[PDB]
Design an enzyme around this catalytic site. Structure first.
Site, short mmCIF file in Angstrom:
data_model
loop_
_atom_site.label_atom_id
_atom_site.label_comp_id
_atom_site.label_asym_id
_atom_site.label_seq_id
_atom_site.Cartn_x
_atom_site.Cartn_y
_atom_site.Cartn_z
N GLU A 149 -6.67 -8.34 -1.27
CA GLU A 149 -7.13 -8.56 0.13
C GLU A 149 -8.65 -8.50 0.10
O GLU A 149 -9.20 -7.44 -0.25
CB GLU A 149 -6.54 -7.53 1.11
CG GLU A 149 -5.04 -7.56 1.17
CD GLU A 149 -4.46 -6.48 2.07
OE1 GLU A 149 -5.21 -5.96 2.92
OE2 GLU A 149 -3.29 -6.14 1.87
N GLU A 192 0.86 -1.22 0.00
CA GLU A 192 0.00 0.00 0.00
C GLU A 192 0.88 1.25 0.00
O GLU A 192 0.74 2.08 0.90
CB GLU A 192 -0.96 -0.02 1.19
CG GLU A 192 -1.85 -1.25 1.23
CD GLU A 192 -2.93 -1.30 2.31
OE1 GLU A 192 -2.76 -0.63 3.30
OE2 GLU A 192 -3.99 -1.97 2.09
O1 LIG Z 1 -1.79 2.72 11.65
N1 LIG Z 1 -1.33 2.70 10.53
O2 LIG Z 1 -0.09 3.32 10.25
C1 LIG Z 1 -2.09 2.08 9.52
C2 LIG Z 1 -3.33 1.52 9.78
C3 LIG Z 1 -4.03 0.93 8.74
C4 LIG Z 1 -3.52 0.87 7.44
O3 LIG Z 1 -4.17 0.31 6.36
C5 LIG Z 1 -5.33 -0.52 6.58
O4 LIG Z 1 -6.46 0.26 6.99
C6 LIG Z 1 -6.92 1.21 6.02
C7 LIG Z 1 -8.02 2.08 6.62
O5 LIG Z 1 -9.19 1.31 6.93
C8 LIG Z 1 -7.36 0.47 4.79
O6 LIG Z 1 -7.87 1.36 3.77
C9 LIG Z 1 -6.21 -0.41 4.26
O7 LIG Z 1 -6.72 -1.19 3.18
C10 LIG Z 1 -5.63 -1.34 5.34
O8 LIG Z 1 -4.42 -2.01 4.96
C11 LIG Z 1 -2.28 1.44 7.19
C12 LIG Z 1 -1.57 2.03 8.22
#
Ligand SMILES: O=[N+]([O-])c1ccc(O[C@H]2O[C@H](CO)[C@@H](O)[C@H](O)[C@H]2O)cc1
Ligand SMILES: O=[N+]([O-])c1ccc(O[C@H]2O[C@H](CO)[C@@H](O)[C@H](O)[C@H]2O)cc1
Ligand SMILES: [Ca+2]
Lengths: 706, 703
Positions: B338, B171
């Site tokens: 996913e 991502e």
């Molecule tokens: O805390 N963090 O740095 C953190 C937390 C969640 C993150 O991504 C995750 O949650 C998002 C929001 O729901 C989704 O859109 C994404 O698909 C999933 O992988 C990325 C970083």
């Protein structure tokens, strides 16, 4: 000693339905009233829109002279003929998805700029949004009351008319809240300066509290822009106190005006706060009514419940809101002035099968009366619809008075209530847990909310780390209250302000969700509670400041606590539960003096302790958890079990919610399935096991004699 | 016609389950893989966490020397033995609620200050968050690749091993999205300057676009703070363009390093953007990969679908996302890297009966493969979970390989898919409607998003009134797309950038949701579309500016449009529909010379016109409507009927959603009930069936 409505000295469940005469063909008004009555409803409820009846400035029609549906008098007469009592709501604001929220088009065109709510720059926040104490607004409101109030007075119950209750205006402050901006009108500014002078008396006294260096009260301006200094926080805190006095002044002026017409009926107001099917901000809005509820024992507040769906995603909102209303208004029944029936918005569906479960869950959750909103769909005449021609969808009746799916759900629920109301209204749940409601944590609608445009409160800039809105939403509303409900532990909420110690001693445990700040009176109350034999659970912080963020270490000193704030991993261990995720790196680290350490950081530093203090018990956790993991439910369950508190039932499926309500005579077991699963489970009383199968998003009610 | 994965020379529905070997009892690895295979799954997917295998600096364990769950070599052997293909995801970032998002603790402890993402004051944004192009970060990344890539190369499908695809990082940019914070590391700003110099060549050219007063590129500072001036909007726009090139540069360095090991399998990347069970922000996230998708046709992007529940509240999110991915990636299958299975969050329930309906709806909505995330729960080893001990709940298997309720749902959906995949993968919907995707409206992740707490973009300060995020979320995503899906009209999405006129001419209507700004190329493209015979529907504004808010009226002048912007009541009438609620007071009031007025303000001023231009047709509405009333569905239905477009079926219950998928031989009718109501209805082509709440029915027809 439950609180409930009474009819002829008997427990009476208030069942109302909302039927907008102004949005229904008058030839069908009688059919709507007959079909409402046939559900076992005893009351009908409606707005009387100012815009609808003052058709031009000083041209009034209540008799259907200019449009048949302006015949309010005939609607009132029909309610009497069809043996329904009537709730009337003449505004001046009605909201009701009505053009200009009920205010006459002619009025809003005529009003000069200083009738309107203004931003810090002097600009109009919204063309429908007046300044409540504007001289012009209240002059026209008074001329509207001069015509509608004699009609309401003549048709009161005490004159053998049907009118039993009247709402004053509609959801005071809601328009402001959703606008995302606070009112800086010069009436507000001037009333705020008088409030500050009355509160502090001398600029030296104000300077001593704020740590400011003003030469005179003339140098002090209403606070605007972001909080950068503790002195900005103090100014905003007094600005919040002022707005509660301001809303009290508004409703007082309306009430005094109404009473002058010989109107002696019960007066109401309605609490906003649900949005997108959750009510985590509602406690902020109810908190704006603090001064109304202290000063007006004779205005009954009711909840505006808009769940939109019924599932584990919002299961906890209605109970927490009912509990918080009880905490602020303990001498009146908990009731819903607006109790979702159908949907205000076409794209947001309201299923009968959801709402029927919400209705039953509301009875489990202690509701004592409600007004189905909307019982009857409306069609807006003459383009009065704010957002389109049709007013509500998926109601009990369509605008034509055809029965829709929800009609049979309401008839089912009402039939149960009428059969059981004499016992059910007199039932209580056995609450061995009390949760403290500390209103000042909620006084942030000017600086920090889910809907405020500008984030004005950043506690890190003040040398703090526990944001009061984060605490009250995620640690308390969506955390503790959600967790207790999910675990089927009964709780009560008690307003800590002017709180009688004797009203806390009945509980096995008092739970306080605390920031770094708490007033001297509350710190002394919780001190006396423990010393006299109460069991206190306090987290995530022993407070050390007062509401102005000045030194106040009363509770820390009375409990013999020493701590240092230190950074660590979010994860702690507590009561032998590993990997408990906590909200903050900063935690309170306690020395183990005359205490049992029960929680540890990743470096094995003591971030929680239990101790005996006088006749009482204290459990402090120097870390913040809500309900965002299974460890959080394990931790809540462990804390409740410290005082051997037990669930009323053993249930084989931990995802089944239940409530046992009982009196001397009767026991009601409510099972609620907030999940998309057909569940087969067994249960028994905590003192052979019965098997039950429950559909998705459904309920069972069992009645036992004795 | 259709894009789909292939196995043994035949259409193949990719059925992968995510199973994190590093979070599972190695004694049960074979049991997890056997239960996965027994659902009819063909692939298993996992991260290979850098922190987990480089246990100290230059001390690598891939064989379980120091902990049995570090035995990657054995997990690969088990996949081979249990006849599962393998997707591997070695990072460097894996996120996956793994401590440090997968980077070694020893690395983060040791990296210089200048390896971290920095705020505009030179402060570390997060002790977790490196600068993607840090020389120190890429040196260590490369030393991790030097050890893990030989293992992947050994076992890759081009060496007849089980590893069929590999994900590069995880991502890219998700941290800039969720924080709202750009990386101001001087290395990034140096790259930004190079990008600007390369783009404008001279400060004079940049000054003429920005209306800036610089004497050289040396006076140029990276944008920051709220946009107050049109010059700030211009700087921030190019800052967004720069970050799309920056992510391309990062993924290109990773890809070239990977290719150097002779790894020739399919490379992947995964698109975030769902939160709280809707995906209205995901199109912004996909827009951040615009340059990657342009320069790397061998990197397949898949979607990270997290619906949380399945109802009318979110029914439209997965279709819109699938359609936008098809628009930006037309040569590769639409797939979910996913695909929600269980829940990341204990308090956010994932019902087997909801997800079963989501899986069938995904087939209706054109998905060609997916990876159940998480198929198997995990237990975080020795503290390495960012959250609690447990990774995911309500999965197909718990961490000990216990079957949970979702297992039987996945087995049933998989059996359907294997039975139908040869015909189903080769079916499309017949779309006569095309909706334009104008990517510059989406380029706002630094200045305007649902996640960005305070908004840096306030278009009123710039003399505009149509915010591009309000437009693309409320008018387009939750408005037009939600409305067409609710009405059961098929749409396709097309990327308007470098768009072939030829690929617009198949459609009976093109719908453009336009703000006040639109670049000369897209204005020229839409002009040519209508002049050559196309039917264009354009609202709520004829654009008059380009992407730098400099005058551009190509479309306005080519169409002979004149207007004045005037304030009126929010409600208009349109095609005889009374009381259409519109978003703005301000509306375009059109000169009606050579035109048919079809919409009117409360004062009867003309806010919508139809017109013949060359061989085509123009419908212009000078007002914004989404889907917040029944009048909105009426108006969309009226507009579609202007060019006599018909639904593929007559269904007696308007609240039943359907998708007709066909090829020359086969038709599938997917009936979806997104409501909490048992529905009985009948259907016929433009026969009486019952569907449970939140449920489905698939019907086959031979043609
Ligand atoms: O805390 N963090 O740095 C953190 C937390 C969640 C993150 O991504 C995750 O949650 C998002 C929001 O729901 C989704 O859109 C994404 O698909 C999933 O992988 C990325 C970083
Ligand atoms: O447009 N407006 O100014 C406007 C719109 C809605 C409004 O309140 C309504 O929506 C709130 C958010 O759901 C509810 O909490 C509240 O109970 C309900 O009455 C008040 C004003
Ligand atoms: Ca013209």
């Amino acid at each position: 000693s439950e609180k409930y409505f009474v009819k002829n000295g008997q427990p009476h469940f208030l069942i109302s339905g909302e039927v907008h005469y102004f949005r229904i063909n008058p030839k069908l008004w009688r059919n709507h009233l007959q079909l409402l009555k046939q559900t076992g409803a005893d009351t009908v409820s409606t707005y009387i829109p100012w815009d609808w009846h003052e058709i031009e400035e000083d041209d009034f029609d209540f008799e259907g002279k200019t449009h048949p549906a302006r015949n309010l008098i005939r609607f009132i007469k029909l309610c009497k003929e069809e043996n329904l009592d009537l709730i009337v709501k003449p505004g001046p604001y009605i909201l009701a998805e009505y053009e200009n929220q009920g205010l006459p088009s002619w009025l809003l065109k005529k009003l000069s700029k200083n009738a309107f709510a203004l931003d810090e720059n002097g600009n109009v926040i919204s063309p429908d949004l007046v300044s409540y104490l504007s001289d012009e607004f209240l002059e026209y409101t008074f001329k509207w009351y001069d015509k509608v109030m004699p009609i309401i007075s003549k048709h009161q119950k005490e004159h053998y008319g049907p009118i039993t209750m009247m709402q004053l205006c509609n959801e005071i402050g809601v328009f402001q809240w959703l606008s995302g901006k606070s009112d800086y009108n010069p009436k507000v500014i001037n009333l705020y300066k008088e409030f500050i002078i009355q509160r502090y008396k001398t600029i030296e006294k104000l300077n001593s509290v704020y740590s400011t260096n003003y030469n005179s009260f003339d140098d002090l301006k209403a606070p605007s822009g972001k909080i950068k200094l503790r002195s900005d926080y103090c100014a905003y805190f007094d600005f919040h106190l002022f707005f509660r006095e301001y809303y009290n002044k508004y409703i007082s002026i309306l009430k005094n005006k109404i009473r002058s017409f010989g109107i002696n009926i019960k007066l109401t107001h309605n609490i906003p706060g649900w949005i997108y099917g959750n009510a985590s901000e509602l406690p902020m809005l109810i908190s704006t009514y603090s001064e109304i509820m202290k000063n007006h024992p004779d205005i009954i507040f009711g909840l505006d419940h808009i769940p939109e769906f019924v599932s584990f995603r919002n299961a906890h909102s209605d109970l927490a809101c009912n509990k918080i209303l009880e905490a602020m208004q303990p001498e009146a029944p908990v009731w819903a002035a607006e109790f979702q029936a159908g949907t205000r918005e076409h794209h947001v569906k309201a299923y009968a099968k959801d709402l029927e479960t919400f209705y039953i869950a509301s009875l489990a959750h202690g509701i004592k009366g409600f007004n189905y909103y909307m019982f009857s769909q409306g069609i807006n005449p003459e383009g009065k619809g704010f957002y389109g021609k049709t007013f509500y969808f998926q109601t009990a009746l369509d605008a034509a008075s055809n029965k829709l799916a929800l009609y049979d759900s309401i008839k089912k629920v009402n039939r149960f209530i009428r059969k059981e109301q004499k016992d059910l209204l007199r039932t209580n749940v056995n609450s061995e847990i009390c949760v403290g409601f500390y209103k000042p944590y909620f006084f942030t609608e000017l600086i920090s909310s889910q809907l405020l445009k500008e984030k004005k409160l950043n506690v890190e800039e003040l040398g703090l780390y526990i944001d009061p809105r984060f605490l009250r939403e995620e640690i308390l509303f969506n955390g503790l209250l959600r967790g207790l409900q999910t675990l089927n532990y009964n709780y009560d909420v008690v307003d800590l302000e002017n709180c009688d110690l004797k009203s806390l001693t009945a509980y096995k445990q008092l739970w306080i969700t605390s920031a770094e700040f708490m007033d001297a009176e509350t710190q002394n109350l919780l001190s006396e509670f423990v010393l006299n034999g109460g069991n206190l659970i306090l987290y995530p912080a022993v407070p050390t400041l007062d509401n102005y963020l000045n030194r106040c270490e009363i509770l820390k000193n009375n409990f013999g606590i020493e701590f240092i704030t230190k950074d660590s991993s979010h994860k702690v261990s507590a009561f032998g539960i590993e990997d408990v995720f906590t909200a903050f790196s900063k935690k309170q680290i306690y020395n183990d003096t005359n205490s049992k350490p029960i929680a540890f950081t990743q470096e094995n530093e003591i971030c929680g302790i239990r101790k005996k203090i006088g006749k009482g018990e204290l459990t402090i956790l120097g870390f913040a958890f809500g309900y965002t993991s299974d460890e959080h439910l394990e931790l809540i369950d462990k804390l409740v079990k410290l005082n051997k508190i037990k669930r009323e039932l053993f249930v084989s499926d931990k995802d089944i919610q239940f409530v046992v309500r009982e009196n001397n005579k009767s026991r009601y077991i409510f099972f609620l399935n907030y999940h998309n699963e057909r569940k087969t489970f067994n249960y028994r009383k905590s003192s052979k096991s019965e098997e039950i199968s429950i559909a998705p998003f459904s309920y069972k009610v069992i009645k036992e004699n004795k």
